[model samples]
Target chain A: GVLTIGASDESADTILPFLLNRVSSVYPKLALDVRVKRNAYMAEMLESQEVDLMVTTHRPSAFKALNLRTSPTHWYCAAEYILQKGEPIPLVLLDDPSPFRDMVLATLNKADIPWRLAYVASTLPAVRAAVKAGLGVTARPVEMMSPDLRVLSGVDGLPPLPDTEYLLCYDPSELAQVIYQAMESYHNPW
Target chain B: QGVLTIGASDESADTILPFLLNRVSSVYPKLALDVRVKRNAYMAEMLESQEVDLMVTTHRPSAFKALNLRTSPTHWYCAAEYILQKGEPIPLVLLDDPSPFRDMVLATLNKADIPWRLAYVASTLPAVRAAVKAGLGVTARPVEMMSPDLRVLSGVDGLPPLPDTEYLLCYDPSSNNELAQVIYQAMESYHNP
Candidate 1:
């Protein structure tokens, strides 16, 4: 049977392949319908039963959640990116309706840091691309770090970011239980 | 809501489509758009089926005349510190099949008799690029999509060269020209201005 899975772009990039690969290897005949959107919409989809299972940040209090991983957010940019002298910190961001973008705005506002939107893209990968291009920096989970990008430090004039959790939300069916076990195998986020 | 569905390849969708639509929405304020982002070849299929009113793609579908927007240089790129081992088949990070980028990489490698294999595969551009960034493997993409963390490969690295990537605007003539023309005009501002 096919399972409709909903996820945010964050989890889709970080954990989806492993989950999908796990299920496929165990049950090669099974098919999956993946719906990738923002974290906000994903929670709504889960509430409305639009998806049979989900992997995203901040599970609803009442939903059954399988805690997958927890990671603190950090500001990241290309290694060679040199901040302009006397210019506002440039942010590479997703467009509107983004929790990450909102988090960034609120954090900067609270800290009284002068920052501006330097480049805006539609996906997390595009956000990485902009950051990689030295267009600006972005705040994302620590697990998103890669060889191509470097972390921005507090000494680099940026404020602290809150930690976030990544987890699975589902109502157990035969298929969902099978997937939950597969997810449990990947529980070691270390 | 008003309707106008648009199709586009990754390069345009991530870079310009959103901003272009922001401009289009102002000229036709009540208009709504359903944008489908796919690989270049799949984008052409949508054009042929009339699934989209307009598209910014690499191939000009046979069913419609198009505007030659801009062309970009495509190359195999990998992280700066990524190392290739002696006699090892090249590991490739790619979008799944029906992807023109993946086909081009395979086609060129096969023609050159270069040994290569898919090391990481993803359904979306962001994940594909992430794998490459993680030093999982190399991928083929346009220069506009490049950044400082990546460097290009050429025959010097035992890889064949790729053809330039073209950006074409294909539209259905039977559709609303008022909307079509407005988008065309919007594209000019994006590319020209």
Candidate 2:
């Protein structure tokens, strides 16, 4: 049987491989269908029984979920943008109502830095492309941020953003247990 | 019985981890793993400094006791359409690091007198793959890692054949941990099987 797991796009590069390889190795015959979904929709799918397991930042109290790890989000932009952008810096962000977008806006407001939303995107890849193309700066989970994207912080006059927690909500199984342990024990480099 | 620190490049993550978890972990369930990903040169340095219990890499350093775990032939890959309408000075996409694999490609091209230029350089596999897929340039990667959209360049089209890389499992001679030895033997048997 295939183990259908849903994971946030943020973990697509690192933790995704770690969990997939770990589970697949133990049960060579077991197949896997790992889908990358937005946090909100991932929870929806999990509630509807569309996915057997989900690793997400959103932890709904009703479901069986565990805080597997904490991941930091950082401001990222193109180096050219840092050198060229003028005051009231242009910002690229997800549309309103997104936790990421809200946190970024709140942080900037609290720091009393003037900013404007120059571009709004619904997806991570789109936001990344917008930032890469020098449209505007955006915030990203540290693990998912590309090496080419320059990190911004106190040095760059940007306030530090809050860290996000990853929760594993899944139907308990031997494979799920392995994944839970692997994630809970992961030491964050940040 | 004891912790075994393993070091390798991210390129081997898909190939190496499955092997360790399946064969090695089953035998030595108590062994702890502290796996680190680094460049080929750094992996060599870690082995020499005894910072890692075992290292897996395609490049062989002269200082360590190395075992030939496996061999996979490297092949040139690019977007299928790029090869048919190829242009010169052959644009090459490569990892931004000094590696035996990178050197082999440069050596082969220089020997063959093929005019080439680096069109794109990236440090990660996904980045390199994206560059190759977007028709920026051709890259050499293990044949097995090529996805359906990537087509292997034919040597008949004046492209030189790349040398097969021997994946070596290297270890320091002084540190003889039983768990490391058990894992090494399992890997050897797994590859041979």
Candidate 3:
């Protein structure tokens, strides 16, 4: 049988291989199709049965959900980036309608820290590149810390960010059990 | 929203697509972009089949070639903390076949008579980045994809130079529609500039 798995663009790439590996080991004949999309898009796909399971931010109504740990958002920039303190902090952000974009703007709004979108891109990777290019700073998951990113905190004059849950949302069915059990049995690094 | 389907691999999808799309959007307010990320090998087929109106691919397609974007030379990169045992087999981390950069990296190594061993493999670029960052092994990518913390290996480091990758933008030859022409021009202008 073919299992269609849905995932958000921000979902840890390391996570699916483990889950898929387990399923493939158990049923060698199973063919898995992985689809990466925005959570809102995937939510609709799940509803339309275009996807069997998904790793998403929230548990939609009438769906089974497993908490797969929450990740904290933090301000990050390239290591060599110099923070020029000013009235409006330059922010590298994803285009509008993104959860993180709104979340970051709201955080700054509540903190009353004047901020401006210095660089806006369509994808997360592009946004990271903009930040790495020293265009501006960005808010991303702490897990995104890689070779070049510099994390900013209170000392860096940045406000705190709220944590977002990684909910493994799926329909309650025998086919979905494979994912549920596999997810529950595995240990996540983050 | 007027649908404008675009087919691209991860390489162009992440870096150039955003700028090109933004330019096209500003020019054509009715064009709604639907970016389809697929294997480079399959993108050409989508272009000819009309599944996608435009495609950016490393390989040239038989369809009309609208524009070509030349990427910077791919260089061997590793984490700053990664130690390469000189004169030993170069531990290499690469994606599986069909990835042009992987083929280029291996080809350059072979032509230079450099020995390498597969240290790790991943399907996606993000996973490859993670593996290289964790000091697993060296990989090859253009500067745009390289993070600041990774060190680029040069000929001085006993590594052969890799060639630049040329990407072709393909569209239906018979397409004279305003949307397709304007969209092609947007990408052309972006590349020409």
Candidate 4:
């Protein structure tokens, strides 16, 4: 089996499974030998070929020299205000410093809605737990819920947020037939 | 005011869940379905507690020994096969007694006297999937669980449909009496020949 060198920060979480399922569907014969590293260390692995493929939202110009395939963002989590079901009002959002974090907070703030920064975390799970605990209403992608979480919908003003964009990235130059095939399959218009 | 806890086979929230969810909603139109996808032990515990309104599970753990259970149709599980390099003798993963599947495989192997080593006992469909793919050993599983890669081998020596259990529509005696009744009635309608 050729080394696929797929990297993820957390496979036990949600999106990793989707990526794996996609890989298996595209190439059922290929065995995926995945190695996970914290997002903090993802770039170093990419530069050195310690990992052959990675999915990241990070768009560092340094890594732009590498090949990139951007995936359409889908719902990853949803934030619900438990107090009222369908009323538009100001919500308090705890924004993480990631690129999507500001976009989420700004979307709410720009609508002339009231919101205050509650807290920040580096990962998605912590933010989700806080939302589920009814901390404060913040926009989260729909896929991260524990599956038991009821859809917090029809409650006044919060609109659903689209999922995070997952990019399939690798170094320039053809590495392997399997790798090229995997990319071609992933570049679907859908 | 009421709270209901639920349990099933791990977080298989991907596939089998949709059917389970549909059944739950059709049975209980008003109350919320608290879906809990846990290990076999947890489902058994919930059933024992009478806390679960309804359950969708394949394995019946010993913990539910005393609890009353109602069985559904037997899921036609596919027997599994072992794939190996040509001329290499293939071994099977057989469970020891107390495991119904293991008992079945053991009986067949003994009758045929198939020269084989005992592969490690795996508890669930997913484990069997990985094990078969890795070429560690082969197991008999429900046909629905088979992937395109794992070759479905029969029980050794023409052993016919060794004691496979059905997915039961189960409930404990004490908890949520009304919901349990509703589930029981639904199972009657849903059961197949």
Best lDDT among the predictions, by candidate number: 1
DockQ of all predictions against the true structure, Cα-based: 0.02, 0.01, 0.02, 0.01
How are the candidates ranked when ordered by lDDT, highest leading?
Answer: 1, 3, 2, 4
Model 2 lDDT tens row, A1-190: 7778888776555355656776777578988898887666776777777777787765666677765444446677763344233477688987754667877888889989889998997887788898988887787655444434555555457786776666678655265666655555542211
Worst 10 residues of 2 chain B by lDDT: B79-88
Which window of ten consecutive residues has the lowest lDDT sum in model 3 chain B? Answer: B66-75
Cα-based TM-score, every candidate: 0.46, 0.48, 0.49, 0.39
lDDT of each model, Cα atoms only? 0.74, 0.69, 0.73, 0.48
- What candidate 2 gets wrong by more than 4 Å, as runs, is A1-190, B84-87, B189-193
Model 1: how far is B82 from its true place, Å? 0.2
* Per-residue C-alpha lDDT of model 3 across residues B1-193, encoded as one tens digit per residue: 4688889987777666665677778878886888899866778678777788888777666657658554333557887436666778998998888787788888889998899999998888778888988889998875555554565565545788566555567778776556566678777665443
**Candidate 1 lDDT, tens digit per residue, A1-190?**
8988888888886667656767788788978899998777876788788888899876567678886544446788875466553578899998986778999989988988889999987777788888888898888865565546656655467787876666888864277776887776655322
Tell me the tens digit of each residue's lDDT in model 2 across B28-129: 788777888787768888877767788888787788777765444467777634543344577888887676667887888999888889999887777888
> What is candidate 1's lDDT per residue for B52-122, written digit by digit as tens?
77888775567776775544456678864466564789999988876778888899889888898889989
Alpha carbon lDDT of residue A160, candidate 4?
39
Residue B39 CA displacement from its true place in model 4, Å? 3.7
Better of 2 and 3 by TM-score: 3
Evaluated at residue B46, the lDDT of candidate 1 is: 82
Docking class of 4: incorrect
